């Protein structure tokens with residue numbers, strides 16, 4: 330009877346947004362069981378009752394999902410990094426992109442605190458952000474002089490989830506969408522933006538050492554012409570990644586972070 334996105338879950342009641350319209354609903358069939366329980370971000374078919382209430386009959390197949398917090402069908406993961414306080418880190422950024430792609434997410438890169446970054450440092454970060462744009466990511470570098478609402482409404486349509494450490498500047502964006510002014514979705518013009526971040530932790534537990542190269546997008550792309558179909562680009566001969574490194578089309582820090590994570594993600598915790 331109606332199709333929409335779950336924007337709130339409160340003690341087994343699922344609020345479903347239907348183009349602005351809100352419905353408090355409960356699951357039936359499979360969706361009453363824990364192994365099929367609805368999550369915020371689910372697209373659902375529900376039966377309308379009592380004007381603004383309803384029963385969820387179908388939860389559509391999840392295109393993607395985070396477990397902590399539990400949220401499904403993210404259209405863009407915005408990785409939020411400070412330029413300073415703390416200092417921008419390609420080591421932390423590469424790790425967040427690996428996690429992002431391991432969850433099958435679209436990712437883009439947002440650097441904050443430009444207005445208090447030394448201008449010489451701004452040029453070094455700008456050159457780093459160029460390397461990520463050559464890999465295929467959209468990047469922005471913003472400060473207090475920038476319109477945070479204009480920025481969010483230029484983002485691709487659908488569900489945006491901000492992921493990054495506390496203090497990087499997620500709330501400064503999110504407060505523009507808080508009606509009051511465990512995960513809830515807030516409306517924006519072309520979709521939603523999420524209450525919570527996506528990660529930071531031992532979201533490495535599910536990753537096989539063999540998958541790490543798939544989530545370095547330029548290694549994955551250049552590995553197409555390595556001799557070996559599963560070349561790890563470490564000791565293998567005829568390696569196209571090590572060649573592209575040599576002639577300067579893969580950045581050394583990217584290769585070095587791949588190597589550290591390949592060596593680390595193997596290890597017992």
Ligand SMILES: Nc1nc2c(ncn2[C@@H]2O[C@H](COP(=O)(O)OP(=O)(O)O)[C@@H](O)[C@H]2O)c(=O)[nH]1
Pocket residue numbers: 441442443444445471472473493494495496497498499500501502
């Ligand atoms: N100067 C400056 N400070 C910022 C910027 N973005 C965030 N902050 C500050 O950094 C701190 C953390 O911001 P907040 O949005 O609460 O971070 P969250 O923990 O990631 O949500 C706060 O004191 C913010 O006002 C920025 O672009 N420039």
Ligand SMILES: [Zn+2]
Pocket residue numbers: 552555560561562563565567568569570571
């Ligand atoms: Zn290779």
